Curated annotation (Swiss-Prot):
Its EC number is 2.1.1.218. Belongs to the class IV-like SAM-binding methyltransferase superfamily. TRM10 family. This is tRNA (adenine(9)-N1)-methyltransferase. The lineage of its organism: Archaea, Thermoproteota, Thermoprotei, Sulfolobales, Sulfolobaceae. It comes from Sulfolobus acidocaldarius (strain ATCC 33909 / DSM 639 / JCM 8929 / NBRC 15157 / NCIMB 11770). One of its GO terms (molecular function) is tRNA (adenine(9)-N1)-methyltransferase activity. It is found in: Cytoplasm.
């Protein structure tokens, strides 16, 4: 876990408001982001009760404890507990652009749908469903991700397009400095067409930067799976991982 995960931050803010400094987490993963996910999706919450345990981790100043030891909590995280409201983060936004879907051959379509589904598991590792948007087909359904036919673009979105054949090379800071990431499909020998976003751009005269991810100066060792690209971006932004190490780990 990173020290400053977006979802951990908003959860901890709420817990602090409530004067909660410790939580008995049991068998859960020792990360406020992991707890948030279970609270948002799986019917977990807090139960008021006195426990002791050992300090496992301290995340945004909230002690997460488990087992036995010298620490105390007054709230235990578990199934059927009460939820607390948190301000779910708008950013960052991960956008899968499936405008091109009907131009893909059958192998490409099949890979793509599998990769998209895998993205739901990835997003849940770092953020939550609501930070994932699939665009290009209004019918599909993928957990609680945002599903739209066309791209809706706010004043504050600062998008970059992930493109093996882009002219900008991705750096750590390019990624941290942007808040919306567009990944389209591979259309024959590599280029990644983001069609529904191209449509928006042409229609309003915008131009978004096109960013190629390289390892050691080459687009060689780099995954081209949408779900793997997504995880790289999120390693860097939410875990404060090096781009180099993020790529390695995948």
């Amino acid at each position: 876990r990173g020290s400053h995960m977006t979802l951990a931050k908003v959860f901890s803010q709420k817990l602090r408001e409530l004067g909660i400094s410790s939580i008995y987490i049991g068998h859960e993963r020792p990360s406020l982001q992991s707890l948030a996910i279970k609270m948002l999706l799986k019917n977990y919450g807090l139960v008021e009760e006195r426990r002791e345990g050992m300090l496992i981790t301290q995340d945004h100043g909230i002690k997460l404890i488990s087992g036995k030891g010298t620490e105390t909590s007054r709230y235990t995280f578990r199934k059927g507990g009460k939820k607390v409201s948190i301000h779910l983060p708008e950013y960052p936004k991960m956008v899968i652009d499936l405008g091109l879907f009907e131009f893909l051959n059958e192998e490409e379509k099949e890979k793509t749908l599998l990769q998209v589904d895998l993205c739901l598991s990835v997003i849940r590792k770092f953020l939550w469903d609501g930070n994932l948007t699939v665009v290009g087909k209004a019918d599909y359904v993928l957990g609680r991700a945002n599903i739209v036919q066309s791209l809706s673009l706010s004043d504050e979105d600062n998008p970059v397009i992930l493109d093996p054949y882009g002219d900008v090379v991705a750096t750590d800071q390019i990624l941290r400095d942007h808040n919306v990431f567009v990944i389209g499909g591979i259309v024959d020998k590599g280029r990644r067409l983001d069609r529904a976003t191209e449509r928006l751009a042409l229609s309003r005269g915008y131009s978004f930067p096109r960013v190629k991810i390289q390892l050691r100066g080459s687009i060689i060792g780099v995954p081209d799976e949408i779900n793997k690209i997504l995880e790289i971006i999120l390693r860097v932004k939410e875990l404060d991982q090096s781009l180099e190490e993020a790529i390695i780990s995948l």
